Design an enzyme around this catalytic site. Structure first.
Site, short mmCIF file in Angstrom:
data_model
loop_
_atom_site.label_atom_id
_atom_site.label_comp_id
_atom_site.label_asym_id
_atom_site.label_seq_id
_atom_site.Cartn_x
_atom_site.Cartn_y
_atom_site.Cartn_z
N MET A 1 -54.56 26.44 15.49
CA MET A 1 -53.63 25.34 15.83
C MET A 1 -53.60 24.11 15.69
O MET A 1 -54.86 23.62 15.68
CB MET A 1 -53.21 25.82 17.54
CG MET A 1 -53.01 27.19 17.98
SD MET A 1 -52.96 27.32 19.61
CE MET A 1 -52.21 28.89 19.86
N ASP A 2 -52.68 23.57 15.00
CA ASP A 2 -52.69 22.01 14.76
C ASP A 2 -52.35 21.35 15.67
O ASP A 2 -52.34 21.65 16.98
CB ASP A 2 -51.99 21.69 13.52
CG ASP A 2 -50.23 22.02 13.68
OD1 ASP A 2 -49.77 21.29 14.45
OD2 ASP A 2 -50.01 23.04 13.00
N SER A 3 -51.88 20.03 15.84
CA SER A 3 -51.74 19.17 16.85
C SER A 3 -50.48 19.62 17.73
O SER A 3 -50.75 19.80 18.74
CB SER A 3 -51.41 17.65 16.31
OG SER A 3 -52.40 17.11 15.56
#
Ligand code: CDL
Ligand code: CDL
Ligand code: 3PE
Ligand code: 3PE
Ligand code: 3PE
Ligand code: 3PE
Ligand code: PLC
Ligand code: PLC
Ligand code: PLC
Ligand code: PLC
Ligand code: EHZ
Lengths: 78, 55, 93, 183, 80, 155, 149, 353, 105
Positions: free
Chosen positions: C39-41
Site C-alpha cells: 500500500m502506498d500513501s
C-alpha cells in the site's frame, strides 16, 4: 469625600441619599411600603381626634335575646 | 453628590415617564396634520422637462 | 467502560482489511502495511481511516508518518478507546 | 357565594348530569294531628321590601321561635312547630295589611327592587314614600339596631352610593308627593 | 389490573417523565381531598387542599432546579 | 353518556405510546384539563380555577421552559388495546356497594344570613385560626428562593 | 384638522360594543319579565287588556347562597325562578310541591380512571382489600340484629 | 303556524344572544386591525388603508379571506396538529376570557364571585398556548423566540396578577361587576394612577405588543414565531393577538376607569329621561349607552396601543426581565401593603354588599 | 381546641353538632372509660357518610322486588331534568307543561 460610599453607622442621612440617587428603584419602593405600617400605627391617634370606630357587624346569626322564654305570650294561635 | 436635580426630582421624571409622555404628545401633533399622500393613478407626482424615461 | 480487548480489535480488523486490495489474505499482528500489503500513501490512508470508522478512534498527525505495522494499530485502539457520553435519559432512569 | 351543594339547584344542567341529580317530589301532607297553617305566599321582592315591617309587627314572635330552637337542644324542627305557626301567621298579617292599606306604595317599592337588583341603596325614593305611609296607618317604624338613631343609612340625605339608573315611577311618585304632601 | 403495576408502562423513559408522574400522583391526593372537603361541607379540608397545591408547587421548582443544574453539568465544559 | 370517560380513555392510550418528552408534557396538560373541568362542574368551582392559575400558570409553562433546555432526540396495537380493555373492566375505586349506588340529599337552612364565598372562610381561618400553617409555608417559600439560587448559580 | 377618515374604524368598533350591549340588555330583560307574567305560556305572551303598565325586571348579579333558595321558592310559587307574587296566603299547591335534589357522592371520574392518578398505597387498599369493608359491614349488619333482641 | 313559531324563538333566543354577543366582539376585533393602520398612518403622515372597501372599511375581511385561502405548509401529509394547536389554544384562551366582561348590570355570560381568578386563569392558558408555537417544528426562528417568549410573559404575569389583586383588595371582591359598580364615587385612575401605568405596561408585555415586542422581533427574527405559520394558522394566531388588545383595553377601562359607568350621571339621566320605561325601546337605548360608555373608554386604550407603538422604540430583551423583577415587582409589592394600611387606619375595611 | 367541620359560611356544618358531643363525652371527668361514648362516635360517622342509612335503602329496594312491588307505585315521583320542572308538574292550577326558564336568572 468627593464620591465616597457613605458609612451607615456614621452618616445615616448621607447613606440614605446615596441610595436615593444611585438606586431609585430600591429607595422609593421601601418608602411607599413604609407608609403601610406607619399609617397603621397612627390609628390610635385617629380613634380620639377624628372619629370613633363603627359597631361590629351582626354576622353571628339571628341575635338571640339574653333572657328566658315568655310563658305569657299568646295570640296568633290555632 | 454633584447632580443638579435632587433625588426626588430625578425619581419623578424616572418613575412617571416624563420623556415618553412628551414623546407621545409630539406624535399626537402629527395626527392633526394633513398627510402628504397623493392618490395614484388619479394624480401624479411632479416631473421635470429633463426627465429620462421611455426612449 | 472500554469493552474492547486485543483479540476483539484483531478479529474485526481483518474484515476491514479483507475489504481492500491486499497482496496476501494472511494478516496478523506481525504483518506490515506498506510492505506486506503493498500500500502506498493514498491506499494506506483509506484503510487507516476505515479503522477509524469502525473502532471509533482518531489517529493524530504525530503517528501519521510513524505507522509501519498492523499490530500497532490494534494495540493503539485499546489505549485510545472510550464510550461516548450518554445523555441524562440513557444513563439514569 | 355560589358553591355547588346537595340541597338546592346548582349552576348548570351539566352539574346535575355529573351528579345524576334527581329532583324528588313528596305527595303526602303533614299528618292530621299536626294543625294546618297557610304558608306565606310572597316572593323575594315583596319580602325584601317588607322585611323590616315584618320585624316590627312580629318582633315578639320571631324571638320566641328562635329562642325555642335554642331551648330544644338540637330537636328544633319537632319541638318548635307550634311556635313556627305563630311567626307565619304574624308575617301573613303584615303582607295582608300592606295590601289593603299601603298597596300603592308597596308595589312601587318592591317593583323598584326588582328593577335594581334587590339592592336597598337603589330604591331610596320609593322607600321614603312607603315608610311615611306605613307610619300613618300601621305605626310601624323601620329601625336598624346597634347604631344611633341619626346614623341609620336610609335617613342619610346625601348617600355616597346612588343607583346608576333612576327608576321612573319612583321619580314620578316622589315628585307627585314632593309638592302635594310635602308643601 | 393495577396489582400488575401497569402504571409503570405509562411512564416515560426520561428523568423529566418521572417528575411528571409524581405531580400527577400528588394531584390525585388533592382531588380526593376536595372530594372529601366538599361533601362534608368542611372548609378545613379545603385549607389542606390549598396547602397541598402550594407545597407541591415548591417541590416542582426544587426538582427542576436540580435537574437543570444536573443537565448543565454534562455540558459544563465551557472552553470558549 | 358521560363524555368524561372517553377523554380519559384517550389519555390512557397516548400515555402508553408516549415516546419523547413532547408526549409526556402533553400528558400533564391532558391530565390537568379533565381535573379542572370535572371540578368546575360537580364538586368545587373555586379550586377548578385555583388549579389553572397555579398548575398551568406557574408549573406547566415552567415544565416546557426547562424541557427546551434538556434534549430533543429521535408490542403493537392489539396489545395496547387489550391492556386498556381489561384495565377498563373495573372502575369503582371504592367497594362499599351501598355507599355507591344509593343517592342522598341535604336540607338547606336559613340560619347563615351572612352568606360568604368559600374563599372568605378559608381566609378567615388560614389567616387567624391556622396562622402557623401560613407562616411556615412562607418560610418554606423562603427556603426555596435561597435554595433554587444555590443549586443553579455557578458562582 | 381632525381626520374623519381615521375615525371611521372607531365608529364601527363603537357599534361593535353597542350590538352586544343593546341586544343582551334588551333580550335578557325582555325574557325575564315575560316569564314572570304567569305560570303558563297562554298568559306569558298574551298582552292583557285589563293590566297596567308593564314593569320589567333586570338581571340579578352578585347573588349569594340565599338567592338560590329564593329562586327555588319562587319557582314553587309562580312557575319561574323570578316570579312576582305578593299574596298573603300561598296556593294549596305550594304546601306539597317542595323539590329536594337527590344525587350521588362518588369520586370524580378522573380520580378513578386515570392510568396513573388512581394508583396509591391507600387507593389499592380501598379497591382490592376487604379489610376495610369487613369491619364496616358489621356496623350495617348490627342495625338489623339489634331490633328484635 | 304561529304557535309553533313564537315558542320556537323561545327555544332559540339565548343561542342568538350569544351569536349577537360573539359578533359584537369580532367586529371590534376585526376593525382594530383597520383602526391600527389608520391611526398609525396619520401619526406618520401616511393615509392608511382607504382603498379596500368604501373608505377602507372592508380591509380586515380582505386579509381574512386572503389568508384563509392559501396553501398550508405542513411537515408531512397529515401533520396538521402541530401547526394548529398553538393558534387554537391561544384563540380559545382569549375567547373564553370574554365570558366574564359585563356589558352592564349583570350583562355577563358568566357571573361568579371568582370572575377575577377565571379571567386570570384563562390568561395563563393563552400563555401556554403561545409557547407551543415555537416547539419542535424544526429550529430556525420559532424556537429561538420560545425561551425568550416564555421568560417574558411568565415574568410580567406576576406584575399583572398583583395589580389585579390590589384592585380586588380595595373592594374585597373578586366579582368584576362588584369592582365596576364600586367605582361610582371614584375611579381608580385617581387613587391608583401608578397601578394603571403598571397594568398597561404589563398589559403590553403580556400581549407581546411593542415596545416589548422581542417575541416577533421583526429586524431580528424575521417574523418571530410566525415565520413558519401561514394561511389559517396565521389567521387564528393573529386573531388571538388582537383579541387580547381589545380585552386588555377593556380590562383597563373596567378596573381603573369605572367600566360601563357614565362619564356624567346628569347627562346620563337626561338621555334616559326621554324613553318610557314600560316599552322595550328604553332597554335597547340603555344598553347602548352603558356599552357605549364602556366602548369609548375601551377605545382610548385601543387607540393607546397603537399610539405607543408609533412613538416608542423597542426595548432590549435582557432589560425587560431586569425591569419587572427589579422595578415593577417591588413597587407592586409595596402598594399591596400600602393599601391595607390606609384602609384600616381610617377604619374602612371593605365589605361585599 | 381547634375547629373541625366548618361549613362554607364560617359556622358549624351539618355534622359538627354530632362531633362536639363526642368531644364532650370523651373529655368529661365522670366517665371511668370510653365505653359510654361508643354510640356517640357511631352517630358522627353516620352523619358524614350515612352508610347505615344507605344500607337500609338497599334492603328496601331489594325487598320491594321479592313481593312483586313496582317502584312506580311505592317510590317517590321525581323529575330528572331541571328545565322540565314544569308548572303543571309543580301543581300550579293554571300551569302548563312548557319548559321553565333556567337559562339566566
Ligand atoms: C436599617 C439599616 C441597617 O441597620 O442595616 C443597614 C444595612 C447596611 O448595608 P450596607 O451599608 O450597604 O453594607 C455596608 C457594610 O458592608 C454592611 O456590613 P455590616 O457588617 O457593617 O452590617 C451588616 C448588618 C447585617 O444585616 C442585617 O442584619 C439586616 C437585617 C435585616 C434588616 O449588621 C449590622 O449592621 C448590625 C446592625 C443592623 C441590625 C438590623 C436589625 C434589624 C431588625 C431585624 O443595609 C441593609 O441591610 C438594608 C436592610 C433593609 C432592606 C429593606 C427591608 C425592607 C423591609 C420592609 C419593607 C416593607 C415595609
Ligand atoms: C374641539 C372641537 C373641534 C371640532 O369638533 O370641530 C372641528 C372638526 C373639523 O376640523 P377642521 O374643520 O379641519 O378645523 C379647521 C382647520 O381645518 C384646522 O386645521 P389647522 O391646522 O388650521 O388647526 C389645527 C388645530 C387642530 O384643531 C383642533 O383644535 C382639534 C382639537 C381636537 C382635540 C381632541 C383631543 O390645532 C392643532 O393642530 C392641535 C394639535 C395638538 C393637539 C394635541 C392633543 C392634546 C389633547 O370638526 C369635526 O369634529 C369633524 C371631524 C369628526 C367628525 C365626527 C364623525 C366622523 C365620522 C364618524 C363615522 C360616522
Ligand atoms: C408599635 C406601636 C404599638 C402601639 C399600638 O399602636 O397598639 C396599641 C393600640 C391600642 O391602643 P388604644 O388606642 O388605647 O386602643 C383603642 C381601642 N379602642 O392597638 C391598635 O389598635 C393600634 C394598631 C397599630 C399596630 C398594628 C401595626 C403595627 C405595625 C405593623 C408591623
Ligand atoms: C385543543 C385540542 C388540540 C388537540 C391537539 C392534539 C390532538 C391529539 C390528541 C391528543 C390529546 C389526547 C390526550 C393525550 C395528550 C397528548 C399526548 C400525545 O401523545 O399526543 C399525540 C399527538 C398526536 O400525534 P400522534 O401521531 O397521534 O402520536 C405519535 C406522535 N409521534 O402529538 C402530540 O404530541 C401533540 C402535539 C401538540 C401538543 C399540544 C399540547 C397538547 C394538547 C393540549 C390541549 C389538549 C387538552 C387535552 C384534550 C384531550 C383530553 C383527553
Ligand atoms: C375481573 C376481575 C378483575 C380483578 C382485578 C385484579 C385481578 C387479580 C390480580 C391478581 C390478584 C392477586 C391479589 C388478590 C387480591 C389481594 C389479596 C387479597 O386481598 O385477598 C384475596 C385472596 C383471598 O382472600 P380471602 O381468603 O378470600 O379473604 C377473605 C377474608 N374474609 O388472597 C389470595 O389468597 C391471593 C393469593 C396471594 C398469595 C400469593 C401471591 C403473593 C406472593 C407473590 C407476591 C408478588 C411479589 C410481592 C412481594 C411483596 C414486596 C415486598
Ligand atoms: C397608588 C398609591 C400611590 C402610590 C404612590 C404614592 C405617592 C406618594 C409617595 C410617598 C412615598 C415617597 C417618599 C418621598 C418623600 C421623601 C423623598 C425624599 O425626601 O428624597 C429622599 C431623600 C434624599 O435627599 P436629597 O433630596 O437627595 O438631598 C440632597 C439633594 N442633592 O432622602 C432623605 O434624606 C429623606 C428620606 C425620608 C425617608 C422617609 C420617607
Ligand atoms: C411610587 C411611584 C410609582 C410609579 C409607577 C409607574 C412606574 C413605571 C416604571 C418606571 C420606571 C421606568 O420606566 O424605568 C425605566 C426602565 C429601567 O431603566 P434603568 O434600567 O434604571 O435605566 C435608567 C437609568 N437611570 C436611572 C440612570 C435613568 O426602562 C425603561 O426605559 C422602560 C420603558 C417603559 C416604557 C413603557 C411605555 C408604556 C406607556 C404607557 C402609557 C401610554
Ligand atoms: C357620544 C358621541 O357623540 O360619540 C359619537 C360616537 C362615538 O364616536 P367614535 O368614533 O366611536 O369615537 C371614538 C373614541 N375616541 C374618539 C375617544 C377615540 O359616534 C358614533 O357612535 C357613530
Ligand atoms: C357591509 C357593507 C360594506 C360595503 C363595502 C363595499 O361596497 O365594498 C366595495 C366592494 C369591494 O370591492 P372594492 O375594491 O372594495 O370596491 C370598492 C373600491 N374602492 C375601495 C377603491 C372604493 O365593491 C363593490 O361595491 C362590489 C360588491 C358590492 C359590495 C360587497 C360588500 C360585501 C357585502 C356586504 C353586504 C352583504
Ligand atoms: C427610610 C426608607 C428608605 C430606606 C432606604 C434603604 C436602602 C437600602 C439599600 O440600598 O441597601 C443596600 C444593600 C446593599 O447593596 P449592595 O448592592 O449589596 O452593595 C451596595 C453597593 N456597594 C458595594 C458599593 C456598597 O442592598 C439591599 O439590601 C437592597 C434591598 C432590596 C430590597 C428589595 C425589595 C423591597 C420591597 C419593598 C417592600 C415590599
Ligand atoms: C464533498 C466534496 C469533496 C470535494 C473534494 C475536493 C478535493 C480537492 C482536491 C485537492 C487538489 C489539490 O489542489 C492538490 C493536492 O491535493 S496536493 C498534492 C500535490 N502533490 C505535490 O505537489 C507533490 C507531493 N506529492 C505527494 O506527496 C504524493 O503525490 C501524494 C500526495 C500522493 C502522497 O501520497 P504517497 O506518496 O503515495
Amino acid at each position: 469625600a468627593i464620591g465616597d460610599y457613605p458609612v451607615y453607622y456614621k452618616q445615616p442621612i448621607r447613606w440614605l441619599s446615596y441610595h436615593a440617587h444611585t438606586r431609585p428603584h430600591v429607595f422609593y419602593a421601601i418608602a411607599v411600603a413604609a407608609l403601610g405600617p406607619v399609617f397603621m400605627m397612627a390609628t390610635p391617634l385617629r380613634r380620639k381626634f377624628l372619629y370613633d370606630d363603627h359597631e361590629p357587624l351582626p354576622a353571628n346569626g339571628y341575635p338571640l335575646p339574653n333572657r328566658s322564654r315568655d310563658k305569657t305570650l299568646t295570640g296568633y294561635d290555632d | 453628590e454633584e447632580s443638579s436635580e435632587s433625588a426626588l426630582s430625578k425619581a419623578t421624571k424616572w418613575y412617571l415617564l416624563s420623556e415618553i409622555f412628551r414623546g407621545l404628545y409630539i406624535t399626537l401633533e402629527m395626527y392633526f396634520r394633513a398627510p402628504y399622500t397623493i392618490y395614484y393613478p388619479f394624480e401624479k407626482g411632479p416631473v421635470s422637462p429633463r426627465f429620462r424615461g421611455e426612449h | 467502560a472500554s469493552t474492547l480487548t486485543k483479540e476483539d480489535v484483531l478479529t474485526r480488523s481483518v474484515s476491514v482489511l479483507r475489504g481492500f486490495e491486499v497482496k496476501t489474505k494472511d494478516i496478523d499482528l506481525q504483518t506490515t502495511f506498506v510492505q506486506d500489503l503493498g500500500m502506498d500513501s493514498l491506499d494506506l490512508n483509506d484503510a487507516l481511516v476505515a479503522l477509524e470508522e469502525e473502532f471509533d478512534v482518531v489517529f493524530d498527525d504525530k503517528t501519521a508518518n510513524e505507522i509501519k505495522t498492523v499490530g500497532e494499530v490494534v494495540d493503539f485502539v485499546l489505549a485510545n478507546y472510550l464510550p461516548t457520553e450518554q445523555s441524562i435519559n440513557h444513563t439514569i432512569r | 357565594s355560589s358553591t355547588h351543594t346537595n340541597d338546592s339547584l346548582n349552576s348548570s344542567n351539566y352539574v346535575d348530569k355529573l351528579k345524576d341529580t334527581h329532583f324528588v317530589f313528596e305527595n303526602d301532607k303533614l299528618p292530621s294531628e299536626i294543625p294546618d297553617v297557610e304558608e306565606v305566599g310572597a316572593t323575594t321582592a315583596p319580602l325584601l321590601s317588607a322585611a323590616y315591617f315584618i320585624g316590627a309587627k312580629c318582633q315578639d314572635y320571631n324571638d320566641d321561635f328562635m329562642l325555642c330552637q335554642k331551648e330544644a337542644k338540637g330537636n328544633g324542627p319537632i319541638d318548635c312547630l307550634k311556635e313556627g305557626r305563630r311567626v307565619t301567621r304574624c308575617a301573613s298579617g303584615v303582607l295582608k295589611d300592606l295590601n289593603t292599606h299601603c298597596s300603592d306604595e308597596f308595589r312601587l317599592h318592591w317593583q323598584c327592587l326588582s328593577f335594581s337588583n334587590l339592592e336597598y341603596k337603589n330604591c331610596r325614593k320609593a322607600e321614603s314614600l312607603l315608610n311615611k305611609c306605613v307610619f300613618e296607618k300601621m305605626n310601624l317604624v323601620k329601625k336598624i339596631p346597634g347604631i344611633p338613631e341619626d346614623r341609620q343609612i336610609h335617613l342619610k340625605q346625601n348617600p355616597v352610593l346612588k343607583p346608576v339608573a333612576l327608576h321612573q315611577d319612583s321619580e314620578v311618585a316622589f315628585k307627585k308627593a314632593q309638592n302635594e304632601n310635602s308643601i | 389490573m393495577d396489582l400488575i403495576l401497569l402504571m409503570l408502562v405509562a411512564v416515560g423513559l426520561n428523568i423529566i417523565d418521572i417528575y411528571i408522574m409524581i405531580e400527577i400522583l400528588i394531584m390525585g391526593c388533592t382531588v380526593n381531598t376536595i372530594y372529601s372537603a366538599s361533601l362534608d361541607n368542611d372548609m378545613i379540608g379545603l385549607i389542606y387542599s390549598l396547602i397541598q397545591i402550594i407545597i407541591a408547587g415548591v417541590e416542582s421548582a426544587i426538582g427542576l432546579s436540580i435537574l437543570v443544574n444536573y443537565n448543565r453539568i454534562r455540558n459544563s465544559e465551557e472552553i470558549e | 353518556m358521560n363524555l368524561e370517560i372517553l377523554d380519559l380513555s384517550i389519555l390512557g392510550f397516548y400515555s402508553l405510546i408516549s415516546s419523547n418528552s413532547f408526549e409526556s408534557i402533553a400528558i400533564l396538560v391532558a391530565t390537568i384539563m379533565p381535573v379542572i373541568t370535572e371540578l368546575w362542574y360537580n364538586y368545587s368551582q373555586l379550586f377548578a380555577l385555583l388549579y389553572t392559575l397555579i398548575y398551568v400558570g406557574a408549573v406547566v409553562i415552567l415544565f416546557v421552559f426547562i424541557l427546551s433546555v434538556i434534549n430533543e432526540k429521535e408490542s403493537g396495537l392489539f396489545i395496547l388495546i387489550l391492556v386498556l380493555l381489561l384495565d377498563d373492566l373495573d372502575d369503582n375505586e371504592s367497594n362499599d356497594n351501598d355507599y355507591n349506588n344509593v343517592y342522598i340529599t341535604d336540607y338547606a337552612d336559613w340560619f347563615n344570613n351572612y352568606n360568604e364565598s368559600d374563599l372568605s372562610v378559608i381566609g378567615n381561618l388560614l389567616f387567624t385560626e391556622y396562622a402557623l400553617l401560613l407562616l411556615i409555608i412562607s418560610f418554606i417559600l423562603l427556603m426555596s428562593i435561597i435554595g433554587l439560587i444555590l443549586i443553579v448559580k455557578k458562582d | 384638522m381632525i381626520p374623519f377618515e381615521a375615525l371611521i374604524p372607531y365608529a364601527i368598533m363603537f357599534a361593535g360594543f353597542c350590538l352586544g350591549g343593546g341586544v343582551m340588555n334588551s333580550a335578557i330583560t325582555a325574557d325575564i319579565t315575560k316569564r314572570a307574567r304567569g305560570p303558563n305560556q297562554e298568559i306569558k305572551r298574551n298582552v292583557g287588556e285589563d293590566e297596567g303598565p308593564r314593569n320589567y325586571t333586570k338581571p340579578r348579579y352578585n347573588t349569594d347562597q340565599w338567592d338560590k333558595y329564593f329562586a327555588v321558592r319562587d319557582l314553587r310559587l309562580t312557575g319561574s325562578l323570578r316570579g312576582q307574587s305578593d299574596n298573603a296566603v300561598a296556593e294549596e299547591s305550594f304546601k306539597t310541591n317542595s323539590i329536594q335534589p337527590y344525587s350521588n357522592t362518588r369520586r370524580p371520574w378522573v380520580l378513578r380512571r386515570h392510568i396513573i392518578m388512581k394508583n396509591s398505597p391507600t387507593k389499592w387498599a380501598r379497591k382490592y382489600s376487604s379489610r376495610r369493608d369487613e369491619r364496616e359491614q358489621e356496623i350495617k349488619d348490627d342495625y338489623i340484629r339489634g331490633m328484635g333482641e | 303556524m304561529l304557535n309553533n313559531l313564537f315558542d320556537f324563538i323561545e327555544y332559540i333566543e339565548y343561542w342568538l344572544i350569544i351569536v349577537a354577543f360573539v359578533a359584537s366582539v369580532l367586529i371590534v376585533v376585526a376593525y382594530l386591525t383597520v383602526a391600527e393602520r389608520k391611526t398609525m398612518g396619520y401619526m406618520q403622515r401616511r393615509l392608511g388603508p382607504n382603498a379596500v372597501g368604501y373608505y377602507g372599511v372592508l380591509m380586515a375581511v380582505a386579509d381574512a379571506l386572503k389568508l384563509l385561502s392559501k396553501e398550508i405548509v405542513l411537515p408531512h401529509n397529515g401533520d396538521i396538529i402541530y401547526v394548529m394547536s398553538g393558534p387554537l389554544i391561544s384563540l380559545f384562551s382569549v375567547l373564553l376570557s370574554w365570558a366574564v366582561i359585563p356589558f352592564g348590570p349583570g350583562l355577563s355570560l358568566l357571573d361568579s364571585e371568582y370572575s377575577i381568578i377565571y379571567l386570570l386563569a384563562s390568561g395563563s392558558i393563552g400563555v401556554f398556548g403561545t409557547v407551543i408555537v415555537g416547539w419542535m417544528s424544526n429550529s430556525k426562528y420559532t424556537v429561538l423566540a420560545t425561551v425568550r417568549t416564555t421568560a417574558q410573559l411568565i415574568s410580567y404575569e406576576l406584575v399583572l396578577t398583583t395589580v389585579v389583586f390590589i384592585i380586588a383588595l380595595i373592594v374585597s371582591s373578586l366579582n368584576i361587576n362588584v369592582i365596576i359598580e364600586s367605582q361610582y364615587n371614584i375611579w381608580y385612575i385617581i387613587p391608583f394612577f401608578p397601578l394603571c401605568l403598571i397594568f398597561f405596561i404589563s398589559a403590553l408585555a403580556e400581549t407581546a405588543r411593542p415596545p416589548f415586542d422581542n417575541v416577533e422581533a421583526e429586524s431580528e427574527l424575521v417574523s418571530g414565531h410566525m415565520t413558519e405559520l401561514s394561511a389559517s394558522p396565521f389567521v387564528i394566531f393573529f386573531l388571538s393577538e388582537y383579541c387580547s388588545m381589545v380585552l386588555m383595553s377593556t380590562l383597563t377601562a373596567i378596573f381603573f376607569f369605572g367600566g360601563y359607568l357614565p362619564f356624567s350621571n346628569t347627562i346620563h339621566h337626561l338621555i334616559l329621561n326621554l324613553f318610557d320605561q314600560h316599552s322595550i325601546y328604553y332597554f335597547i337605548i340603555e344598553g347602548i349607552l352603558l356599552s357605549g360608555y364602556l366602548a369609548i373608554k375601551a377605545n382610548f386604550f385601543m387607540f393607546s396601543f397603537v399610539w405607543i407603538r408609533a412613538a416608542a422604540p423597542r426595548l432590549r430583551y435582557d432589560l425587560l426581565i431586569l425591569f419587572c423583577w427589579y422595578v415593577l415587582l417591588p413597587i407592586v409589592f409595596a402598594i399591596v401593603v400600602f393599601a391595607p394600611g390606609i384602609l384600616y387606619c381610617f377604619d374602612a375595611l371593605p365589605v361585599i354588599i | 381546641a381547634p375547629l373541625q367541620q366548618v361549613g362554607r359560611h364560617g359556622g358549624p356544618n351539618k355534622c359538627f353538632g354530632e362531633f362536639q358531643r363526642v368531644v364532650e363525652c370523651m373529655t368529661n371527668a365522670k366517665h371511668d372509660s370510653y365505653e359510654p361514648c361508643n354510640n356517640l362516635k357511631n352517630d358522627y360517622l353516620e352523619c358524614r357518610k350515612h352508610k347505615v342509612e344507605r344500607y337500609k335503602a338497599f334492603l328496601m329496594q331489594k325487598h320491594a322486588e321479592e313481593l312483586g312491588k313496582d317502584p312506580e307505585e311505592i317510590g317517590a315521583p321525581f323529575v330528572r331534568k331541571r328545565r322540565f320542572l314544569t308548572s303543571k308538574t309543580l301543581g300550579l292550577v293554571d300551569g302548563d307543561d312548557y319548559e321553565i326558564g333556567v337559562e339566566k336568572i
